[PDB]
Amino acid sequence: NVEEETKYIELMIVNDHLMFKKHRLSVVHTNTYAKSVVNMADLIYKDQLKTRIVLVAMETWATDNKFAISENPLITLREFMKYRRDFIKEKSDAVHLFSGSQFESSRSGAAYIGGICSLLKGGGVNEFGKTDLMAVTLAQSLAHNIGIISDKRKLASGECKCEDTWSGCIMGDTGYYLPKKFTQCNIEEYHDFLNSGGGACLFNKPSKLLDPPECGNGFIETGEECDCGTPAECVLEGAECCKKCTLTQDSQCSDGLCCKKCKFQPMGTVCREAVNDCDIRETCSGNSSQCAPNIHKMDGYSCDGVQGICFGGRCKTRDRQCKYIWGQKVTASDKYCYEKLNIEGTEKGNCGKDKDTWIQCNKRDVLCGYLLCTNIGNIPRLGELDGEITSTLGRTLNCSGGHVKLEEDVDLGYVEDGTPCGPQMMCLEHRCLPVASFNFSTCLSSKEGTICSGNGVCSNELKCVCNRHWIGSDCNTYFPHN
Amino acid sequence: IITEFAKSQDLPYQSLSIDTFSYLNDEYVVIAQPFTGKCIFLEWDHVEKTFRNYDNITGTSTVVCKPIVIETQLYVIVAQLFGGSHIYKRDSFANKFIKIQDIEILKIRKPNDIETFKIENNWYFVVADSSKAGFTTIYKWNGNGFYSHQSLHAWYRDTDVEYLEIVRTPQTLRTPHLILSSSSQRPVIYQWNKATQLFTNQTDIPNMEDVYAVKHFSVKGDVYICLTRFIGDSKVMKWGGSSFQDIQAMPSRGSMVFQPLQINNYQYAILGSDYSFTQVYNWDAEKAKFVKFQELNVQAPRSFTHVSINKRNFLFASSFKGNTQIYKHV
Amino acid sequence: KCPAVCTCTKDNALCENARSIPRTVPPDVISLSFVRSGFTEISEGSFLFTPSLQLLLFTSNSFDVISDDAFIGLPHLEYLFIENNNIKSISRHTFRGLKSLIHLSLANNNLQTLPKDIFKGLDSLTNVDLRGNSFNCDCKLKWLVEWLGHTNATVEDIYCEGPPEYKKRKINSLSSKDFDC
Ligand SMILES: [Ca+2]
Ligand SMILES: [Ca+2]
Ligand SMILES: [Ca+2]
Ligand SMILES: [Ca+2]
């Protein structure tokens, strides 16, 4: 499943001018330092998260900084992500900035929560430090990127506690004695993020690295045909297929999900089952050692029932938002709350925080305003309460909300953009707008207003994942075979 | 005859900090055991000629147990990595330690060092906080407790704080000073402001990067400091009146402690090592430099403390990975 | 496991008076030391069995010859402190394969000469220590002068002890052409 596979974070590191200065104005020294940091972070990740941190690209600002580095990690993160969107063009899962300055906050770095595999959010900023300390900082930034957060509710309730009372755990505040392990709740959060469709870009094994090839690293690079890694674990799998990074006579692979007993597993076999409604099952191609890259349904499909629209392979609803902000016991409040609170209210139902007259939401659809949930507790799972928890009361309904903030200026207490406010009707900026406004792309279809000529699902890469036994590009020709 | 350090006892537990104090005309030793969360109190047995266990304070992850004697009353500042830091008072009537105060968890989060000092008949202690969120704070004794006085080095991971008194030389009198050591930063010298009753005039010590700890000693009225570097060169510097100038450098291989110790008017310096032997240095008065004296076999030394008992001198070596050791200067 | 001659720990072993290089040292150690050991000849492939060594230290030993390329099997060795010993001969290819060595020490070894191009291949070096030696500054030592004048790693000041006309001056101050011999 998703939890036994190995995930690969193709990471790109950007060293600013201050980080360049901190290493005697030498490119090679900065590159070696960053490689060591990434290697220790990978050592931390591989043991517990079953995830490899692979450094695939790097750039150093030897001349000067491309933007003004601020002492606020969040402003620096926003500016760095804008620069990455505008200027950085290398393909990577995450792009993290190695900054030589020191941030003036409690945190040694800032990263977007669950933002990996995204152009606008897939990255973070980290401040200079010792190689081990800065490796811990990079590890926690990447954990934020892969949906691992410090659950305030469970920590206060004592549901889970870090097993190390000396060095603490990675998500906590770091002292002289650096942490080495994640809590069990962190592992569970990572697994939940993976099972919700997140991190679909972490299932490809990198082919080109920044390091010279090693016989036993694990990655099949140029020239090498097979690589089972260190011979210690090669006995479990690939011992009879690959020896000394060389094929053993009649052999087809070294390792992989789509290749068993040194032989290409027949085409059509399942290598990755769909984890949720937005995911697309991956089938072996019959001539590849590794399973196909994790593709899911494009942004626009309907997940669950009608309450959600896929966005990055993850279902986006109001109930899921309530659970993500407050807790699993919390459920979305009834539509009665919305239509009788957002129409007329102050600090209890609204669609904005303008100080003049708040916002008088129009009765077209008030589902895009204040996020009203049921059974809200006293503290949220993440963020910070900007104010006080709302409490409003032939049926009696418990109805509550909040104004939780996050690393950005976005208010979590409002309904996320993209949530369905109606049939063929989805929220955008506190306004229930038609789906045409989002400008969603489509695959190639031959009929009128269909998807891949009717039969066929459009994937995230805008290619038709054809139905069973339809070879045609637009899923139009039925070709019987076996 | 010549002197040397002979091993006396092996205490079967690890330790980080070892402290000594005088309480009711008696000499005591406090050992902070990290992994059991205990402040172990030892007293000198006048019958068996050994150090007997006296009392215990139970914590969770104790890094420092600093004793403070304020007017014949013993207070212990216990710094903990987990569960917060507390202040205890020795109740001589019941012969037990009572917890009299709690330090806020939001202020002191990851303590690494505690230093106590007296300025004009006022008692202070400083906690070095190794976290960005927690700041190095000065607490002042107001007659019934310790309350926050000043925060010094914000957003820095301070690993050591050193109190010393040095003569700045537009003047002749000796004024209080504080030296702060932080990760990836140069040591910082603070000067006490008598008017505002605060430590001000932040100033760096140049050419010394990533110093773990600083410890001072005096030789014939001249103040020197020992600079602790984990891997590299540990250095000795001399106060020139307005700055510290290098005296000599020493090879450091896993060195977490560089402790000056004065025993019988003899100046010693012990440089610990996690990867090699621990080197004891003797001060050559004619050459005004430390010369190699002896090698100690202690597993990952964390501190070195000298105890004087009725004209017998003892050396307590705290071992982070093995048995803490007691030596005798013979 | 830990040899009886070595006082090992979770991640550090201190082998004192060992007459041979340990081979069955537990692979969880990342720091190995040798103080006043008995063996006087480090041969090739003496550290293959311990690939986890990140720090290697020698002190107060007595070495006749250190064999060619004696540090294979240590792809993560960042610190190598061969100091305070008495090494009669050091080999040219000794430090081969140490592409991650950032700190190397050869201090107080009473060395009088060093083979040509011994530091080549150590691109990651950031600090080389060579104090306490008695290097002869003559025609057999142009390579070190050129390397000191060309390298970027922090090397502390060292002094000549060779010809009477080259007494007590920095090798960093020596010139490539200036070698009377
Ligand atoms: Ca990828
Ligand atoms: Ca390879
Ligand atoms: Ca899939
Ligand atoms: Ca101190």
- Say if CB B313 and CB B263 are below 8 A apart: yes
Q: What's the first-to-final CA gap in chain B, in angstroms?
A: 10
Specify whether the backbone of A300 is left (phi greater than 0), alpha (psi in -120 to 50) or beta. Answer: left
Residues of C in contact with B275 (CB under 8 A): 12, 14, 31, 33, 55, 57
Chain A interface residues (partner B, CB cutoff 8 A): 102-108, 128-130, 133, 165-166, 168, 173-177
Chain breaks in chain A (C to N over 2.5 A) after: 393
Sheet holding C103-105, edge to edge: C13-16, C31-35, C55-59, C79-82, C103-105, C127-129, C154-155
Tokens of A436: 């045409």
Q: What's the first-to-final CA gap in chain A, in angstroms?
A: 26
Q: Is B255 helix (H, G, I), strand (E, B) or coil?
A: coil
Contact between C14 and B276 using a beta-carbon 8 Å cutoff: yes
Please identify among residues 108-137 of chain B the ones whose CB lies closer than 8 Å to any CB of chain A. 109-110, 112, 129-134
Sheet holding B231-239, edge to edge: B213-219, B222-228, B231-239, B244-253
Picking from A105, A107, A83, the residue whose alpha carbon sits closest to that of residue A95 is A83
Mutate to test the interface with B, among C33, C36, C78 (most CBs of B within 10 A): C33
Residues of B in contact with A103 (CB under 8 A): 132, 155
Helices (H) and strands (E) in chain C, counts: 1, 10
Q: Solving technique for this entry?
A: cryo-EM
Picking from B160, B177, B180, the residue whose alpha carbon sits closest to that of residue B168 is B177
A16, β-bridge pairs = none
Chain B: closest CA distance from residue A330 (Å): 30
Cα distance between residue C101 and residue C173, in whole Å: 26
- Say if CB A430 and CB A414 are below 8 A apart: yes
CB-closest option in B231, B251, B274 to C12: B274
Cα distance between residue B292 and residue A93, in whole Å: 55
Indicate the helix (H) or strand (E) that contains A322: helix A318-325
CB-closest option in B35, B109, B210 to A166: B35
Contact between A24 and C124 using a beta-carbon 8 Å cutoff: no
Indicate the helix (H) or strand (E) that contains A38: helix A27-48
Distances (CA, A) of A473 to A442, A470, A482: 14, 8, 19
- Say if CB B247 and CB B237 are below 8 A apart: yes
* Helices A131-145 and A27-48: angle between axes, nearest 10 degrees: 60
Picking from A234, A262, A258, the residue whose alpha carbon sits closest to that of residue A248 is A262
Residue A93 Cα to ligand 1 middle (Å): 5
Contact between B131 and A174 using a beta-carbon 8 Å cutoff: yes
Mutate to test the interface with C, among B209, B248, B253, B323 (most CBs of C within 10 A): B253
Find the residue in B nearest to C32 (Cα).
B275
Residues of B in contact with C57 (CB under 8 A): 253, 275-276
DSSP state at residue A190: H
- Say if CB B190 and CB B177 are below 8 A apart: yes
Cα distance between residue C154 and residue C143, in whole Å: 17
Which amino acid is it at C42?
I
Chain C: closest CA distance from residue A214 (Å): 11
Picking from C38, C43, C1, C31, the residue whose alpha carbon sits closest to that of residue C16 is C38
Q: What is the resolution of this structure in A?
A: 2.8
Chain C: closest CA distance from residue A35 (Å): 11
Chain A: closest CA distance from residue B35 (Å): 8
Cα distance between residue A381 and residue A113, in whole Å: 13
Picking from B90, B89, B33, the residue whose alpha carbon sits closest to that of residue B62 is B33
Buried b (16+ CB within 10 A) or exposed e, A261-296: ebebbeeeeebbebbbbbbbebbbbeebbbbbebbb
